[PDB]
Design a protein around this ligand. Sequence first.
Ligand SMILES: [Ca+2]
Ligand code: NA
Length: 293
Amino acid sequence: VRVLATDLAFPEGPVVMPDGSVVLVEIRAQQLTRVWPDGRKEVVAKVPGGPNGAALGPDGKMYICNNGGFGPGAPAPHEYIGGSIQRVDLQSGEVETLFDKCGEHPLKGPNDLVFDKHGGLWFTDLGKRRARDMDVGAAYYIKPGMTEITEQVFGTLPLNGIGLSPDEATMYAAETPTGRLWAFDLSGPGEVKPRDGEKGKPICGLGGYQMFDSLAVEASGNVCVATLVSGCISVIAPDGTLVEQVPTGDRVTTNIAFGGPDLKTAYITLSGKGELIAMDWSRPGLPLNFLNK
Ligand SMILES: [Ca+2]
Ligand code: NA
């Protein structure tokens, strides 16, 4: 295990660039940061609110889930500025807001996102916590071209990690408080399959007191989910079998991304310790669209 950076203000949304650098978000610092291979930290852009997850899109620009702000805890009314999907230019540092609502519903707490091979964009909504109530979770899909958002999953508990199977016929969403990974068969890109209260299958539910954060998929189809409280990566097979749990040393392990040679290096955000770490992985990661393939 290598420590690539420290003193990160709740790092998240690691994107491992081909040049070896990592572009990630710092939710508390409200910025998009680039960790060079030597370790130098450079601020790509300030992203007010709560930049929560990142993914490289077809235009070489960085797409961002902005949760609107944390307090992490429930934000006060005046530090929450509304959720959104944003785009940051890695050359100019310019920030564009693409979407601040689905239909007429303001986006609440966009969390993480993944592109399909057609440029469609899945993202999760964790929702916001308030004083005496909380939003429900959801999963949305932005149609190819970044044209319009559709609400594909709604009414679960807060959703966090999201990914696609290698063949992209299954979408996975992690439900944070329950430690459950949900699999959604797709009839086609961006459309949950007809037939499945619940709209999917809970293929794995961890026992005890464990919660899920973000995730990354392996070329094997295994889904690697950052696991809160127990502080590990839970590797879950497509059938729901818990294959292993890889300790990381931080109760608040939040995300994982694959890079390096053969995509066999796991870049992991230890958000309790404020660190970005690199960890040799036993198997290769699934190439992400527009980033790795
Ligand atoms: Ca997350
Ligand atoms: Na990830």
